[PDB]
């Protein structure tokens, strides 16, 4: 026969190889294809769908819908903090289990802007202004509205808009950040502050709630497929 | 300037995953193994598939077969290389009941013979569903009266794999384990679904025990 | 299949061989290349840079 020489890697079974193999059912006639709605071609399409963020992830709220409710009320002071969490979409509990966070945990590196949407769910009679800020790392988390407003921020008026869409820009020294927590690739902090106050008429509940949504923007990408740490097993399922 | 190639459905699913493994020993007439084919006995591939409601793909099958010497009392055990047979029995076909069964003639059933020490056996399988797509979830019953079996198990009629030692037993028993690996190729997916949050409990249904939506932190401002 | 005959050297691992191998990370999207100063293409470029000679190499 033709002279050949076998190289290293012969007879190996690499789980990510791409080779042809003989068919066990020659000339099998497959069922005709049928148009089904909702075809998906890339996991980024799933990652780009807004999902409700459990910002209130206290131990007493994770087993109910209170985890998604951000309290807000009329205060007697100024510049109080509403919430604050690190921008760790793949490692922080706040964003870990959303659609974006679940897609991220199948990968090792990520890059791109993050779309944050806040919808005010109080009465139509309520008014108020909020300061939503993103602080790049290097310093700590901002501790007051003065520190928060020195970075990227927007002013949200619930009286004018029931939904504010804040797109957190990608500001990093590297092209990609690790999905797991790593200080070398810290992404910063997201905080919200009272710009003026919640103001309501008589016979209106002063305590209201805000819902936060998260999704990837158009420039988002992931790399280095891996097994997720969210599913595990001890024996085969019978 | 950043490509999304590695987040394609193909790249996401076109990786070989163990779906089951079975064992059989050469010391009895019942020394064969069987497995009803399904993708719901392993957590990882099941979760990856259940990100979608309907799927359509070809399948690459790879088997990793290893053997271990069992205790024996004969002096000087010297066994030749072992040959294995794996036979696929579509539903309705006769099934083996012993190692020396006539059904192993595999005149029409597809079968593969493989000897230890070589590369793992591998074959390709087309899309063999009676429907237009595989179903990961089925909110319905098998009986028109809405009694009896409920769920995805109604649609599982994919057949059974049978495995045995071809060689006749020698002076010492040999126990073999066959690991089955599935690799979907040419994948088409529809109706994305929320990723499974609660841990799996059973193979044939979606039963779960309630679990919190996320892990917790001390307060709403904790960083 | 096509008839072949294996020659000596089959299955050997020679540390200076030059063959192709399957990729363990198909379709991986590498980080874009960036211009960095001081690109080196040959060790002779390093060898052509003057360095101080320890001519007085006494033990002290």
């Amino acid at each position: 026969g033709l002279p050949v020489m076998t190289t290293p890697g012969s007879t190996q079974f690499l789980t990510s190889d791409d080779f042809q193999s003989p068919s066990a059912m020659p000339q099998f006639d497959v069922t005709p294809e049928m148009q089904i709605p909702g075809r998906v071609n890339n996991l980024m399409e799933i990652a780009e769908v807004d999902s409700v963020v459990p910002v209130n992830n206290t131990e007493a709220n994770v087993n109910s819908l209170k985890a998604y409710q951000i309290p807000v009320q009329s205060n007697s002071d100024n510049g109080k903090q509403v919430f604050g969490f690190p921008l760790q979409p793949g490692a922080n509990g706040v964003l870990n289990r959303t659609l974006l966070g679940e897609i991220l945990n199948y990968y090792t590196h990520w890059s791109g802007s993050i779309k944050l949407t806040f919808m005010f769910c109080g009465s139509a009679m309520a008014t108020g202004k909020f300061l939503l800020a993103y602080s790049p790392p290097g310093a700590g988390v901002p501790k007051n509205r003065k520190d928060a407003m020195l970075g990227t921020h927007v002013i949200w008026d619930v009286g004018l808009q029931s939904s504010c869409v804040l797109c957190v820009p990608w500001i990093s020294q590297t092209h990609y950040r690790y999905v797991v927590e790593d200080e070398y690739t810290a992404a910063g902090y997201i905080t919200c502050w009272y710009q003026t106050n919640i103001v309501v008429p008589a016979d209106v509940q002063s305590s209201c709630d805000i819902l936060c949504f998260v999704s990837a923007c158009n420039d988002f990408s992931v790399r280095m497929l891996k097994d997720t740490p969210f599913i595990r097993q001890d024996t085969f399922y019978q | 300037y950043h490509s999304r190639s590695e987040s394609s459905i193909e790249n996401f699913l076109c990786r070989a995953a163990c779906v089951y493994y079975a064992t059989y020993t050469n010391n009895s007439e019942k020394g064969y193994a069987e497995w009803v084919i399904n993708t719901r006995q392993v957590a990882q591939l099941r979760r990856k598939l259940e990100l979608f409601t309907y799927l359509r793909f070809d399948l690459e099958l790879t088997f990793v077969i290893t053997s271990a010497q069992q205790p024996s009392t004969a002096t000087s055990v010297d066994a030749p290389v072992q040959t294995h047979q794996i036979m696929y029995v579509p539903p309705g076909g006769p099934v083996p009941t012993k190692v020396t069964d006539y059904a192993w003639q595999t005149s029409t059933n597809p079968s593969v013979f493989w000897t230890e020490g070589n590369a793992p056996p591998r074959m390709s399988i087309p899309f063999i569903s009676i429907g237009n797509a595989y179903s990961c979830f089925y909110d319905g019953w098998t009986q028109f009266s809405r009694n009896g079996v409920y769920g995805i198990n109604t649609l599982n009629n994919m057949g059974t794999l049978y495995m045995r030692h071809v060689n006749e037993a020698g002076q010492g028993p040999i126990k073999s384990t066959v690991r089955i690996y599935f690799k979907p190729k040419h994948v088409k997916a529809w109706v994305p679904r929320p990723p499974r949050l609660c841990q799996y409990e059973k193979q044939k249904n979606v039963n779960f025990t309630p679990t919190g939506v996320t892990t917790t932190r001390v307060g709403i401002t904790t960083t | 299949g096509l008839p072949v005959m294996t020659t000596p050297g089959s299955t050997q691992f020679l540390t200076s061989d030059d063959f192709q191998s399957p990729s363990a990370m198909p379709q991986f999207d590498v980080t874009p290349e960036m211009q960095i100063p001081g690109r080196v293409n040959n060790l002779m470029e390093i060898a052509e840079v003057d360095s101080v000679v320890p001519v007085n190499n006494t033990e002290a």
């Binding site: 042809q20 068919s23 | - | 198909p26």
Partner: peptide
């Protein structure tokens, strides 16, 4: 080689990449 199908069945082909 670069790309040649060795089998008569489409299921035998490598992945779509």
């Amino acid at each position: 080689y670069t790309n040649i199908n060795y089998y008569k069945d489409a299921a035998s082909n490598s992945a779509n990449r």
